Write a protein that binds this ligand. Sequence first.
Ligand SMILES: [Ca+2]
Length: 223
Amino acid sequence: IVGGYTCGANTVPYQVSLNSGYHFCGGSLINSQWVVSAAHCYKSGIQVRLGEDNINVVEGNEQFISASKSIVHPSYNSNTLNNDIMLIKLKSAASLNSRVASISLPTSCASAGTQCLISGWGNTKSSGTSYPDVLKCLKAPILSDSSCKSAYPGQITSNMFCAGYLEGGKDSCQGDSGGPVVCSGKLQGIVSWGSGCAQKNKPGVYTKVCNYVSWIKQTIASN
Ligand SMILES: [Ca+2]
C-alpha cells in the first residue's frame, strides 16, 4: 500500500478524537491532562475520546473525557491559518497504557525529506465524499519549503510545512483536521489545510509544532 492504509487498532496510541455528538477533528495527547489540536477545531462542549479505533463502535479500550479548557494560540489567524494550534485541557487525567499514550514534543524541527506518519479518520476521496470508520495512516516525507511555497504562492508562512507527493494522489485534506504528523517519534505537525485534495502539486499543509514548544510548555504549566 503506497499511501493511505488502516493503521491497526491502537497502533497510534496518542491519537485522539474530538467529539461534539460526532467526530469533528483529531488531536494528540501530549501528557495525561493535555491535548494539542488545530485552532480551527475550536468548539464548545468537546468530549475527547482516547483509545479509539472504530469511532462508531465501543471496542473496549476507549476513555471518554470532557474538555475543561481550550486555549487558542494568541496569534491565530483564521483567514491565513497562520498559527493554527490549540491546547485542550482534560477535565480528568487520562489513564496511560499501551493503547493510550503521550507523544513527545520535538527538541528540534525535522528536515525536508524526513518520513513522517500522519493519522486520522477523515475523507479518503480526492473527488467525492467517503468517510471511513477506523483510524487511517499515511507515511509521507516532509517537502522542501521551495516545493511547498511553489505549490501555494503567497500562502505559506514560517509556521507551516508541506508533506507528501508533488504528483498528488496521496494526501490529507479533510482527511482529519487537527490530527498529528509524527516524525522519528516526535510530534512535528498538525493537520491544518490544503487546497483541493491530493491534487497534482497540491500537498498537505501542516502547523510546524517545533515553533510552538515554548508556548505549549509555558501555557500548560500555567493552566
Ligand atoms: Ca470505538
